A paper describes a structure:
The regulation of extracellular proteolysis is critical to blood hemostasis and innate immunity and proteases [name] (PK), and coagulation factors XII (FXII) and XI (FXI) act as master regulators of several cascades including coagulation, fibrinolysis, complement activation, and inflammation 1, 2, 3, 4. PK and FXI are homologous and share 58% amino acid sequence identity with the unique feature of four tandem repeats of 90 amino acid apple domains at the N‐terminus, which harbor exosites for substrates, cofactors, and receptors 18. Factor XIIa recognizes and cleaves both PK and FXI but it is unknown which of the apple domains is critical for these interactions or the molecular basis of the reciprocal cleavage of the FXII zymogen by PKa.
To determine a full‐length PKa structure recombinant optimized PK active site mutant S559A was activated by proteolytic cleavage of the activation loop Arg371‐Ile372 using FXIIa. PKa crystallized in the presence of inhibitor benzamidine and the structure was determined to 1.3 Å resolution. The PKa protease structure consists of two β‐barrels and the benzamidine inhibitor is observed bound in the active site S1 pocket with the Ile372 residue from the activation loop forming the characteristic electrostatic interaction with Asp558. The full‐length structure defines the interactions formed between the PKa protease domain and the apple domains whereby two extended loops “latch” on to the apple domains with specific interactions shown in Fig. 1C. Latch loop2 adopts an extended β‐hairpin and on its tip residue Lys566 forms a salt bridge to Asp95 from the apple 2 domain and Gly569 in latch loop2 forms a hydrogen bond to Gln26 from the apple 1 domain topside α‐helix. An alternate conformation occurs in the apple 4 domain where an internal Cys321‐Cys326 disulfide distinguishes PK as a monomer precluding formation of the extensive disulfide‐linked dimer interface observed in FXI 19. The PKa latch loop1 is a key pivot point for this relative rotation as it contains the Cys364‐Cys484 disulfide which anchors the protease domain to the apple domains after cleavage of the Arg371‐Ile373 peptide bond in the activation loop.
Residue numbers in the entry: 1 to 358, 363 to 365, 372 to 487, 494 to 610
């Protein structure tokens, strides 16, 4: 299943399938996730190895048992792919690396005022995969304040150096943040030419397009259909690029279908899996396993659960079948595509769903941006007027976690509208879709006007589909990088904020919080956060929203915004419901309702 655990001071021996340079272990893990054979990775930070060639080395590995020998190596980081991890699978990597130079082809150089502006330029340039920003103090005077846009084979830097006054990062195309947008155009009976970066067999042009989208050096493609009379031409998916970034020519050709990478689409990218089953076709590859199963959908499930399976063929031949079960051939190849696509077969083929990514275990702030906090929701009541009252956190397709006190005046579910995948409240019109409540589950021990057990589950009438802008937060099973978000007041006697706000706040021990609030019992089921001087806090209209902390590269929901004495006062921390202490309640209530 999903294995997010990391191994400190550890390096796996052998099983090597690919290597590259990455700025950190999380980016290496992402490459492992998307690589067709990687199950395990090991990463060397520059401090961990003298050998210049091995610093920032990312080593992608496979094993027929899913396990490898490992050695102690100070500073090395090892882990698993995130295959089988559902919505945790994403190619979005927002991190900026200060004091790091990521080398490649420096195809475009311009002046900018910040590393964030350089990143936006990279995101909105079709050829840019990664960038470096040379600050005012960069040693080469002729690069000071310049943004260098870059590409490389495979989209990984050709070298990574520790270097002062350089700040590097990746394009945010895979965060669905491009402003250029994307061409959904499919051209029938039309071929492209240019530079072929890969050649694979696909059952249709749509699989070809998704493979192009996630291939670092694909910008557009041409598919040759199974109608070709020339056998060696059939089902060929050519992944392509051009020195310019756009096709330099087009050629009319029967039984050819062309299109573009969808990596520059806004809000939502195609899912990085091919979920259709194809009747009458056989997908050739190396045999992993054969078992009898009850129908082709179970065969798909079997392939998905066997993490090395890439694709399968379910046989409908009588010699391969019993009364209600037939042979399911689990297969793989070097690149995740079949080695042969044969039609006129008695059987049905498809792919593993292991990478399909569709529960998991403000005062003094600044404006958020798209996809930063994709679990944040707005809880609103419509009577005659409509107004935002509370936040919430998406924790599954049909579940939001919030504060019980949001419902004190209106526990009736019928007047509530829940907005998700929204940054600015001004964007909501009478046309904007919203979720409706099917069930409110207020904690059994919560009492109106009292602070204990301030936690409620909301079951939506319809599931939400995940996008880069709308997806869940993982729940916990110490923290130093915690953030609170919402549209609440920006002053104690303040107003609702149009743009979702964020603020970074340190956690405070219960001991300390209890000293600040001598009139209330601060329990082990509460968590507190704030500054001695105040000035940064949640406020009215933020309640029920998230307190999230990023630990070992992973966001998790640590608190639910609950109360404070006023907002952002000196020596008066915010108090949050401590989600870890309600995990038994969350799992029981969601399993019992479901
Ligand atoms: Cl598809
Ligand atoms: Na697809």
């Amino acid at each position: 299943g999903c294995l997010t655990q990391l191994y400190e001071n550890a390096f796996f021996r052998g099983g090597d399938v690919a290597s590259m340079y990455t700025p950190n272990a999380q980016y290496c893990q992402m490459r492992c996730t998307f690589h067709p054979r990687c199950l395990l990775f090991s990463f060397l930070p520059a401090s961990s190895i003298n050998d210049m060639e091995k610093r920032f080395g990312c080593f992608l590995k496979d094993s027929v048992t899913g396990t490898l020998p490992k050695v102690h190596r100070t500073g090395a980081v090892s882990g698993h792919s995130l295959k089988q991890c559902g919505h945790q699978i994403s190619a979005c990597h927002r991190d900026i690396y200060k004091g790091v130079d990521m080398r490649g082809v420096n195809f475009n150089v311009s002046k900018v005022s910040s590393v964030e502006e350089c990143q936006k330029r990279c995101t909105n340039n079709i050829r840019c995969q990664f960038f470096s920003y040379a600050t005012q103090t960069f040693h080469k005077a002729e690069y000071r304040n310049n943004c260098l846009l870059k590409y490389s084979p495979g989209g990984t830097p050709t070298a990574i150096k520790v270097l002062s006054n350089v700040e590097s990062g990746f394009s945010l195309k895979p965060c669905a943040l491009s402003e250029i947008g994307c061409h959904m155009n499919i051209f029938q009976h039309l071929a492209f030419s240019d530079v072929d970066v890969a050649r694979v067999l696909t059952p249709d042009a749509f699989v070809c397009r998704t493979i192009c989208t996630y291939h670092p050096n694909c910008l557009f493609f041409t598919f040759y259909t199974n109608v070709w009379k020339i056998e060696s031409q059939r089902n060929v998916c050519l992944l392509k690029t051009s020195e310019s970034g756009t096709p330099s020519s087009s050629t009319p050709q029967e039984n050819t279908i062309s299109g573009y990478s969808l990596l520059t689409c806004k809000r939502t990218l195609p899912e990085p899996c091919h979920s259709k089953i194809y009747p009458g076709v056989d997908f050739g590859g190396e045999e992993l396993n054969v078992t009898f199963v009850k129908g082709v959908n179970v065969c798909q499930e079997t392939c998905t659960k066997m993490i090395r399976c890439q694709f399968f063929t379910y046989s409908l031949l009588p010699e391969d079948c019993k009364a209600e079960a037939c042979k399911c051939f689990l297969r793989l190849s070097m690149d995740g595509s079949p080695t042969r696509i044969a039609y006129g077969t008695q059987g049905s083929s498809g792919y593993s769903l292991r990478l399909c990514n569709t529960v998991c275990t403000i005062v003094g702030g600044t404006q958020s941006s798209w996809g930063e906090w994709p679990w944040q929701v707005s809880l609103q009541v419509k009577l005659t007027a409509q107004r935002h009252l509370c936040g919430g956190s998406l924790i599954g397709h049909q579940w939001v976690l919030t504060a019980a006190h949001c419902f004190d005046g209106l526990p009736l579910q019928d007047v509530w509208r829940i907005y998700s995948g929204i940054l600015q409240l001004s964007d909501i019109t009478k046309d904007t879709p919203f979720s409706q409540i099917k069930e409110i589950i207020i904690h059994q021990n919560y009492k109106v006007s009292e602070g204990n057990h301030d936690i409620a589950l909301i079951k939506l009438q319809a599931p939400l589909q995940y996008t880069e802008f709308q997806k869940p937060i993982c729940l916990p099973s110490i923290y130093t990088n915690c953030w609170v978000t919402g549209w609440g007041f920006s002053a104690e006697a303040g107003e609702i904020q149009n743009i979702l706000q964020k603020v970074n706040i340190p956690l405070v021990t219960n001991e300390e919080c209890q000293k600040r609030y001598q009139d209330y019992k601060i329990t082990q089921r509460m968590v507190c956060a704030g500054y001695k001087e105040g000035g940064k806090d949640a406020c009215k209209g933020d309640a029920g929203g998230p307190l999230v902390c990023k630990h070992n590269g992973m966001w998790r929901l640590v608190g639910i915004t609950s109360w404070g004495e006023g907002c952002a006062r000196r020596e008066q921390p915010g108090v949050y419901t401590k989600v870890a202490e309600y995990m038994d309640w969350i799992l029981e209530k969601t399993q019992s309702s479901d």
